[PDB]
Design an enzyme around this catalytic site. Structure first.
Site, short mmCIF file in Angstrom:
data_model
loop_
_atom_site.label_atom_id
_atom_site.label_comp_id
_atom_site.label_asym_id
_atom_site.label_seq_id
_atom_site.Cartn_x
_atom_site.Cartn_y
_atom_site.Cartn_z
CE1 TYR A 41 41.37 38.41 -13.23
CE2 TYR A 41 41.70 40.29 -14.81
CZ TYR A 41 40.91 39.50 -13.96
OH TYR A 41 39.57 39.88 -13.88
CB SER A 42 49.70 39.01 -11.94
OG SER A 42 49.89 39.50 -10.65
N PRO A 238 51.99 40.18 -17.11
CG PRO A 238 49.77 40.87 -17.17
CD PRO A 238 51.20 41.40 -17.25
CG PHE A 239 48.52 36.72 -19.40
CD1 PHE A 239 48.12 37.95 -18.85
CD2 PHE A 239 47.81 35.61 -19.06
CE1 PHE A 239 47.06 37.99 -18.00
CE2 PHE A 239 46.73 35.63 -18.22
CZ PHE A 239 46.35 36.81 -17.71
CB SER A 240 55.85 36.60 -19.34
OG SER A 240 55.63 38.00 -19.27
CD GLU A 256 45.70 41.36 -26.31
OE1 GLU A 256 46.75 41.68 -26.91
OE2 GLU A 256 44.57 41.62 -26.82
CE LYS A 272 43.98 46.10 -31.70
NZ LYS A 272 45.34 45.52 -31.49
N1 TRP Z 1 48.96 35.01 -15.51
C1 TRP Z 1 48.32 33.69 -15.33
C2 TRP Z 1 49.33 32.55 -15.56
C3 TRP Z 1 50.13 32.84 -16.82
C4 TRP Z 1 51.36 33.44 -16.89
N2 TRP Z 1 51.71 33.50 -18.22
C5 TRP Z 1 50.76 32.95 -19.01
C6 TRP Z 1 50.66 32.78 -20.40
C7 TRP Z 1 49.61 32.20 -21.04
C8 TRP Z 1 48.52 31.73 -20.21
C9 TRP Z 1 48.63 31.91 -18.82
C10 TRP Z 1 49.73 32.52 -18.16
C11 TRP Z 1 47.69 33.47 -13.95
O1 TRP Z 1 47.89 34.12 -12.88
O2 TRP Z 1 46.86 32.51 -13.84
#
Ligand code: TRP
Length: 437
Positions: A41-42, A238-240, A256, A272
């Site tokens: 999911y990146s 992946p959620f930076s 996360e 977790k």
């Molecule tokens: N990882 C997400 C996009 C994303 C990067 N950082 C985030 C922070 C919060 C919410 C989403 C993201 C994607 O591929 O769609």
């Protein structure tokens, strides 16, 4: 609604950092970055700035601000956000290659929770940063790592905006430096004490898991964007996100996902359990209590028998640690919004600890300060109806000369004081250390 106009831009793997660097000092400039990660999911990186409307919540009041009009309101902040969203009268059809087509983007802080539950006010409020800081954006810069394309979209004048983008410059420096060592808000004995308080509360039955965190702080000087840039490379989370707010800045290295809402399809992946760099009976047990939590959290709004648990106890290797994640799925009813959902489940069960309200009561009682942006969420509410949000774990708050970074650990009956102490450290040691140089 008339889909937005789109211009495709030249491709480059680092376009996100590349175009964002000239926006990074602008208030309401925000970057969601997939951390160059090797991950399912990146796929995307997203940039916004120059919002046509902003919303700022401090406690009980929300300030809605546009051009020519500024209003204040004590109503529910996510209701208010959704109303702002609907009155923009923008609603494009859904598009798997543009998951954000304008809409809301920003920070949902942990204390925003206080607007959805009555909670004690013991913890000191020593950071002045909003509980809700989100911009309304009629454009976006989207970087798709799967398709290799960079798309600039606008509901407005997409030539005007490319033009504006062009002209923005990447801004004379000022070197980031930490000006003190990191200092915890807790001694080992103070941690010690509150770990046992937690356990007596678990033993006397109020709760069955409570996430207790410590907070590290230091003085610093210089610009935070370069620091973000070296933290991002090293964390590849992946959620930076990098948020330049009016009050200070947020540097999130989160791996996360909180809640994804994609074309009414709901996904949440709570983290977790960890070990430093997965049969672990106590952790793959701490995780299941959180999975049940989420189940219940999303199922308050979900389609009747849509909740499933497609995945349990998977480990994912990250720089600092090995973590365990589970996945819960569901379907949003066609009559509700991603925002009702957010509201039903905020803040994340994985960083509060079931049952959530009593768990939040203890946290406020034992944590010396309010968490503000840490363990709250960052994400977007698109005009097309999609939503994506993170849990702001691995995240620093840079404000008024000071930078903060917290570390939590889930506590259950089987937890042991010194080892849990150490885990809180395990989660952020590479981050404190790199900032020291
Ligand atoms: N990882 C997400 C996009 C994303 C990067 N950082 C985030 C922070 C919060 C919410 C989403 C993201 C994607 O591929 O769609």
């Amino acid at each position: 609604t008339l889909s937005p106009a789109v211009i495709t831009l030249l491709w480059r793997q680092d376009a996100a950092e590349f175009y964002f660097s000239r926006l990074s000092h602008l208030p309401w400039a925000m970057l969601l970055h997939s951390g160059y990660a090797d991950h399912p999911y990146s796929r995307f990186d997203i940039v916004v700035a120059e919002p046509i409307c902003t919303l700022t919540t401090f406690g009980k009041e929300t300030v809605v601000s546009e051009s020519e009009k500024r209003t204040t309101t004590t109503d529910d902040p996510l209701q208010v956000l959704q109303q702002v969203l609907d009155r923009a009268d923008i609603r494009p059809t859904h598009n798997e290659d543009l998951p954000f087509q304008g809409g809301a983007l920003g920070l949902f802080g942990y204390d925003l929770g206080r607007r959805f539950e009555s909670l004690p006010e013991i913890a000191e409020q020593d950071i002045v940063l909003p509980d809700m800081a989100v911009g309304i954006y009629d454009w976006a810069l989207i970087v798709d790592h799967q398709r290799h394309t960079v798309s600039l979209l606008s509901h407005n004048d997409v030539n005007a905006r490319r033009a504006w983008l062009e002209s923005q410059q990447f801004s004379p420096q000022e070197d980031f430096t930490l000006t003190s060592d990191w200092q915890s808000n807790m001694t080992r004995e103070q941690y010690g004490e509150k770990f046992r308080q937690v356990q007596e509360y678990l033993h006397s039955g109020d709760c069955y898991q409570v996430n207790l965190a410590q907070r590290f702080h230091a003085t610093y000087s210089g610009d935070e964007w370069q620091a973000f840039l070296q933290l991002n490379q090293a964390n590849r989370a992946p959620f930076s996100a990098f948020l330049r707010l009016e009050q200070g800045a947020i540097l999130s290295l989160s791996p996360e996902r909180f809640i994804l809402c994609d074309n009414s399809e709901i996904q949440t992946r709570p983290i977790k359990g960890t070990l430093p760099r997965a049969n672990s009976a106590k952790d793959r047990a701490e995780n299941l209590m959180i999975v049940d939590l989420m189940r219940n959290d999303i199922g308050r709004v979900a389609v009747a028998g849509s909740v499933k648990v497609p995945e349990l106890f998977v480990v994912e290797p990250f720089p600092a640690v090995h973590h365990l994640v589970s996945t819960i799925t569901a379907q949003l009813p066609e009559q509700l919004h991603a925002s009702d959902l957010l509201r039903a489940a905020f803040p994340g069960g994985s960083i509060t600890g079931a049952p959530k309200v009593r768990a939040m009561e203890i946290i406020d009682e034992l944590e010396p300060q309010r968490r503000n942006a840490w363990c709250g969420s960052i994400g977007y509410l698109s005009f097309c109806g999609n939503m994506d949000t993170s849990i702001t774990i691995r995240t620093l708050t840079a404000i008024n000369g000071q930078i903060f970074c917290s570390a939590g650990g889930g506590i259950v009956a089987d937890s042991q004081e010194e080892a849990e102490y150490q885990e809180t450290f395990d989660k952020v040691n590479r981050i404190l250390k790199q900032l020291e140089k």
